[PDB]
């Protein structure tokens, strides 16, 4: 078996699981208190996965490409302050994905309100 080593010396029983969930909830509550006006997470893009065994499943992405941001009516530098993730190393290939990302960005822009600097 895979126990010829001194495995007994490193056995971390996950007793923290019960407390880890509460700690994560408290951290989320603290972030909400600090980030009250804004959502706890940034607006992530919709993307299609490689590895055809999973490509049939649509999933979220890291950040919108510069072309998508430009087509969305704003700039990458300005979009960051609005909570929109931007990926400078992602290149759009599929047209449907680009259209979906543009529509999502437009919906987010229409649904957001920005407070005055005052």
């Amino acid at each position: 078996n895979h126990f010829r080593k001194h495995w007994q010396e490193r056995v971390k029983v996950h007793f923290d699981q019960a407390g880890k969930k509460v700690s994560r909830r408290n951290a989320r509550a603290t972030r909400a208190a600090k980030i009250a006006p804004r959502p706890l997470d940034l607006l992530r893009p919709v993307v299609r996965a490689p590895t055809v065994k999973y490509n049939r499943k649509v999933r979220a992405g890291r950040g919108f490409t510069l072309a998508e941001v430009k087509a969305a009516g704003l700039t990458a530098a300005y979009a960051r302050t609005i909570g929109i993730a931007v990926d400078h190393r992602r290149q759009n290939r599929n047209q449907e994905i680009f259209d979906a990302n543009v529509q999502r960005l437009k919906e987010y822009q229409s649904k957001i309100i920005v407070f005055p600097r005052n």
């Binding site: 997470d41 940034l42 992530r44 979220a60 987010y108």
Partner: peptide, 8 residues
Amino acid sequence: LQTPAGGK
């Protein structure tokens, strides 16, 4: 903004 994990 993202889909909520689990139920609601």
